[PDB]
Amino acid sequence: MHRVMGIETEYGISVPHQPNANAMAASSQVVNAYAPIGAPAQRQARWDFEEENPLRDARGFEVARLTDEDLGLANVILTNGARLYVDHAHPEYSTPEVTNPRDAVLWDKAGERIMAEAARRAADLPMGWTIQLYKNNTDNKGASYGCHENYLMNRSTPFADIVRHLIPFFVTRQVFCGAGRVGIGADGRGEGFQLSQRADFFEVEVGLETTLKRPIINTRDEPHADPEKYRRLHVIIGDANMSEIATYLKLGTTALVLAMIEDGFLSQDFSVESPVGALRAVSHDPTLRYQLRLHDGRRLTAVQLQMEYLEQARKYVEDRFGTDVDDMTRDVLDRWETTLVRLADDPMQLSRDLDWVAKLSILEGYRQRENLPWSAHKLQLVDLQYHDVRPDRGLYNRLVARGRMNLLVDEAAVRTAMHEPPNDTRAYFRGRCLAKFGAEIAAASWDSVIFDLPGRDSLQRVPTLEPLRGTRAHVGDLLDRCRSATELVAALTGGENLYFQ
């Protein structure tokens, strides 16, 4: 599997003992508490959806003309290639560019560790606050926050085909991607458990908005790459996942569907009547019996429709690659199929793999011990605890501490990924430059690193416009042998020994 992708996760935030506490200021404290470990972001170090914050232009870039803390402007580039910032009045982590779902899992998991460490550091600074962070999507006050996925696609792929084949897939993906939620409806006052945190907050099929009138297919399309060649697919429908298996399947199955769409492989029409209604109805039935209504009149459970996408993906891979299928593609297909088979038989068999199942198992334990109905406030507390970033307080983290969840990566790899970038994207160059040459870097962003060389009047901008250049294979040996940023820049700007970047 090889496709540029990423995850941007907005974290829930709470400052105990401070009623109505300024979430913007708390979020700035979290980000600023980790700033010593990275470098300032340039003005353009922004995703398009950051337009929905104070004091920005149409691109999310800060404009001129209240303190910057109360405005949530803090924006830091990390040595692992990630970015840490404030969005929608919450701390947000954007992974480095990665090329496959296992690396997405790894650097996204490092983000949870970075958030936990940032909150710990914020408390230690003088006048600093004690701050709790949650990797979930709702605050139980009718508010929702986003876990965004980005996938780099060919600009020539017809958008109408992207929409028509992705909607039924996104309506049903929650059977394995959902994180679970206690309470039904946006206000959470309806009684019961549902598969997804986000489903109740969606209103339309296709649209540009992200923080209101939310669409199943968001149309923001601006890539961190040449827009003539590439489209960014920006997905906002998914819950933040704790389980590594859930995040892996979320990104990996979506990437396989995108490959089928780009190659024109799908001839079926999986269109669903009233997809927003179906999104909610699937979420609200954790017994997995609800049968969607397809436009052609077929009736299929969400699991059954996912199985139709799986069957197409297997045929696509067999026809395109034959017996030269790469290990990760084979693994995603096998885990997708096994998960769907087990979901149809007994979802509770998946408690080591899926967030909503692991969470439901904990909640049912409380219901059995204490004779609690679904409306009991304690169950909403337990729902939230599942997502706490602290290693001893988050319930997912306590399951992992006991070896009770399946993992794709080990903790030593997660710790390394807090500070070292992926090797196969431009995040390598960016992260390694910040680590080795940080003394001579003024700022960085997805598109360039800005060097300040002693004895040179002007700052030196090194562009990094292509996400698949500047990898370890391209520049690792050069970075190893250079002793200063002056030597590095002289090599990169030389016309005889060319570095294509």
Author numbering: 1 to 65, 73 to 508
Authors' description from the paper:
A single Pup ligase enzyme, PafA (proteasome accessory factor A), is responsible for modifying all pupylation substrate proteins and likewise a single depupylase enzyme, Dop (deamidase of Pup), removes Pup from Pup-protein adducts. Depupylase Dop is structurally homologous to Pup ligase PafA, although the two evolutionarily related enzymes catalyze opposing reactions. Rather, before the catalytic cycle of Dop can begin, Dop-mediated cleavage of ATP in the active site must take place to generate the Pi species important for catalysis.
With the aim to capture Dop in a state where the Dop-loop could be resolved, crystallization experiments were carried out with AcelDop, exploring conditions with Dop alone and Dop in complex with Pup and/or different adenine nucleotides. We were successful in identifying crystallization conditions, where AcelDop in the absence of other ligands features the Dop-loop in a well-resolved conformation that is not induced via crystal contacts. Helix DLη1 (η stands for 310 helix) consists of residues 48-52 (DFEEE) and is located nearby the nucleotide-binding pocket (NBP) of Dop, while DLα1 is formed by residues 75-78 (DEDL) and is positioned distal to the active site. The Dop-loop forms extensive interactions with residues surrounding the active site. In particular, insertion of the highly conserved Dop-loop-residue W47 into the NBP leads to the formation of a triple π-stack, where W47 interacts with H231 that in turn stacks with W453 of the C-terminal domain. Another π-stacking interaction is formed by Dop-loop-residue F49 and H155. Furthermore, a network of salt bridges is formed between acidic residues in the Dop-loop and several arginine side chains surrounding the active site. The comparison shows that, upon binding of Pup, H95 swings upward by about 90° out of the way of Pup’s C-terminal residue and displaces the Dop-loop, including residue W47 that moves around 11 Å away from the NBP.
